[PDB]
Amino acid sequence: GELLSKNYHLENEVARLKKLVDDLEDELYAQKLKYKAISEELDHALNDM
Amino acid sequence: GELLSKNYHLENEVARLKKLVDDLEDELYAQKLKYKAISEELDHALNDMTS
Amino acid sequence: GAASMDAIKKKMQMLKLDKENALDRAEQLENEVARLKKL
Amino acid sequence: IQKKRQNKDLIELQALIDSHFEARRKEEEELVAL
Prior knowledge:
The complex is a heterotetramer, with two copies of chain A, one copy of chain C (39 residues) and one copy of chain D (34 residues). Chain A is 90% helix and 0% strand. Chain A is mainly α and 49 residues long. Chain A has one domain (1-49): Single alpha-helices involved in coiled-coils or other helix-helix interfaces. Chain C is 21% helix and 0% strand. Chain C is built from two helices and no strands. Chain C has helices spanning 7-10, 20-23. Chain D is rod-shaped. Chains in contact: A-B, A-C, A-D, B-C, C-D. Chain A binds chain B through residues 3-4, 6-7, 10-11, 13-14, 17-18, 20-21, 24-25, 27-28, 31-32, 34-35, 38-39, 41-42, 45-46, 48-49, and chain B through 3-4, 6-7, 10-11, 13-14, 17-18, 20-21, 24-25, 27-28, 31-32, 34-35, 38-39, 41-42, 45-46, 51. Chain C: It comes from Oryctolagus cuniculus (Rabbit). Chain C: Belongs to the tropomyosin family. Chain C: Residues 5-28 are annotated as: Disordered. Chain C: It is found in: Cytoplasm, Cytoskeleton.
């Protein structure tokens, strides 16, 4: 019935969301590394001053 | 009984996960602006040799 | 993604050219001083 | 000339403190390519 079907769809959302969390965390990590790289680049340029 | 309750459990678990996602989406967007910004700084540090 | 990354290294040796020539030119000014401090 | 032959090391610690910058910034670029 309606409660079974809902549970079915929700079980799916959960799986989707759990996977989405791990992917967004990896992505954050990759972005923070991109930031660090360039944050260092700036301190170098920032001394030729 | 067991079904009603499980349906409740699932509904919270989805809300909880939506918030983790939402937060991460905001962390990412923030990070994007910081990155755009400091990359703009670096443009100036390297090119405003006009000083 | 945004801007220039190695065009960075392009105006970074071009900052090691307009400062390293700051003290080579802060040396020909000493040509009149190692010897001017002599007369 | 001697407090001066740092006229090279004070620029030399500038001339390549700005070398702290890129081989620790090549550490966050190949960690990207891992």
